[PDB]
Structure 1
């Protein structure tokens, strides 16, 4: 592949990974298609990254969060529940292991599986609490694409965390299971169950 010899030896695998920007030098961002047209602009796949660890100022403007790499948004959502706050390096490592596990179990690009999981778990309708001087009812309302992506990621990471709590299975495994089940649209997934519950409750309060 034309290996370049420098005074400091660089491993060939790293030199190969210089020509094409792959996630963790393993997984291509090419061929990663978002099946839902409405989420294309809200799921960032088109700028590839070597690791899910940018120091990007995505919070400073309303929709700049859409332009954050989707895997980084997933990483950031793992590092919650107090004791895990700020531990981004651990979260990135969990994601590496999760993607390795997904690859082995599906033989598909694990980035695609993550995208498919997010598209499938995003609730289309939700209920809002509307009240008119004392009494409050639920009103059915449509959900914005950015909210769909946000809820999808939240449901996946909460489900995976609860499944890993006081269980022998690691967070990497439970997250991989949750993502694979969500990508297949399986009613075993916490995220799918909760999406369908919300949409059913919305339909009932229409």
Structure 2
């Protein structure tokens, strides 16, 4: 490549590794594949970024929320349970750790692990309390793709927090185990469990 030297001392791991191919800090958003063609153009993995801490403008129309690079929406739902509202630097730190741990536990592309988990884990029906008149009847309903990826992101992060809450096994570890056992149909990860529950109650109530 012949990386350039200059009056500034910047390392070749900064420049030559990441100039001319702008992957990520490592583990590219390039050569990536979505499994099912219902997450195509609802999950913007078409462009690589470096850090999911971009000052998002994306709720300010209806559907621009779909064009956040999905690491952003993962780390943006990572800031819940009240006392961790607005702690975005810690949230991106946790995402970096759990992707490194995904890299350790599986030599596959961690972003591929995450997006394939989203595909495997998004609930594809819903039950909805409809009144009509009387005593709270339920109805099955199909789900929007964007609502599906909404529900899936929420499920993965929720299972991560509630598992690692009183437990010494840290949040990156539990999130990565959720990602592995969500990528595979393990039925040992919470989000796969709840996908089974909602689709089961839809199958009952339809």
TM-score (norm 1): 0.97
* 1:19 Cα deviation from its structure 2 partner: 2.6
- Between the two proteins, the alignment pairs up a number of residues equal to 206
**Structure-2 change in CA distance of 1:23 and 1:180 (3 Å):** farther
SS of corresponding position for 2:39: helix
Gaps of 5+ in 1: none
Gaps of 5+ in 2: none
* 1:83 Cα deviation from its structure 2 partner: 0.8
**Structure-2 change in CA distance of 1:110 and 1:81 (3 Å):** same
Hey, what's the Cα distance between the residues in 2 that align with 1:186 and 1:83?
31
Contact 2:97/2:172, CA 8 A, preserved across alignment:
yes
* 1:17 Cα deviation from its structure 2 partner: 3.9
* 1:23 Cα deviation from its structure 2 partner: 5.5
* 1:56 Cα deviation from its structure 2 partner: 1.7
SS of corresponding position for 1:139: strand
Hey, what's the Cα distance between the residues in 2 that align with 1:64 and 1:126?
24
Contact 1:21/1:28, CA 8 A, preserved across alignment:
no
* 1:135 Cα deviation from its structure 2 partner: 2.3
Contact 1:122/1:149, CA 8 A, preserved across alignment:
yes
Contact 2:164/2:174, CA 8 A, preserved across alignment:
yes
**Structure-2 change in CA distance of 1:190 and 1:22 (3 Å):** farther
**Structure-2 change in CA distance of 1:21 and 1:148 (3 Å):** farther
More helix by share: 1
